[PDB]
Design an enzyme around this catalytic site. Structure first.
Site, PDB file in Angstrom:
ATOM      1  N   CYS A  32      66.328 -69.363  51.523  1.00 32.36           N
ATOM      2  CA  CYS A  32      65.954 -70.670  51.001  1.00 32.36           C
ATOM      3  C   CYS A  32      66.474 -70.752  49.570  1.00 32.36           C
ATOM      4  O   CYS A  32      65.791 -70.304  48.640  1.00 32.36           O
ATOM      5  CB  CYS A  32      64.425 -70.800  51.017  1.00 32.36           C
ATOM      6  SG  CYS A  32      63.756 -72.339  50.311  1.00 32.36           S
ATOM      7  N   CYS A  35      64.236 -72.475  47.117  1.00 33.66           N
ATOM      8  CA  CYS A  35      63.119 -71.616  46.734  1.00 33.66           C
ATOM      9  C   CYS A  35      63.512 -70.696  45.593  1.00 33.66           C
ATOM     10  O   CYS A  35      62.764 -70.512  44.644  1.00 33.66           O
ATOM     11  CB  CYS A  35      62.660 -70.773  47.914  1.00 33.66           C
ATOM     12  SG  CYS A  35      61.745 -71.704  49.137  1.00 33.66           S
TER      13      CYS A  35
END
Ligand SMILES: [Cu+2]
Ligand code: NA
Length: 107
Positions: A32, A35
């Site tokens: 991700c 993220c």
């Protein structure tokens, strides 16, 4: 990482729901990029907002139950908790300044 609580299914109620003051929770996982983008931003915000805000992370792969309980539909998702309730939601990566704007509006 010195000021970020790593939350789990088992610690969530004590660490977040029963906590005093606002708690910002980063729902995140590996694989991700967005993220990762906000990871360093969170260390800065945890420091600058210390005493007004607690910052925490919940890995959704490791704690699927908690992710499902809060209806996480994309990562990263930041939930701001106050008194055990979701006060505000911010979806996706954003800059340090944008995160400060979100926090100041909701604190
Ligand atoms: Cu740190
Ligand atoms: Na949003």
């Amino acid at each position: 990482s010195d000021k970020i609580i790593h939350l789990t299914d088992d610690s969530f109620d004590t660490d977040v729901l029963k906590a005093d003051g606002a708690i910002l929770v980063d729902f995140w996982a590996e694989w991700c990029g967005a993220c990762k983008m906000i990871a360093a931003i969170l260390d800065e915000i945890a420091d600058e907002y210390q005493g007004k805000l607690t910052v925490a992370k919940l890995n959704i792969d490791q704690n699927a139950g908690t992710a499902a309980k809060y209806g996480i539909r994309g990562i990263p998702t930041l939930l701001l908790f106050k008194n055990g309730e979701v006060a505000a939601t911010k979806v996706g990566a954003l800059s340090k300044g944008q995160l400060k704007e979100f926090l100041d509006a909701n604190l």
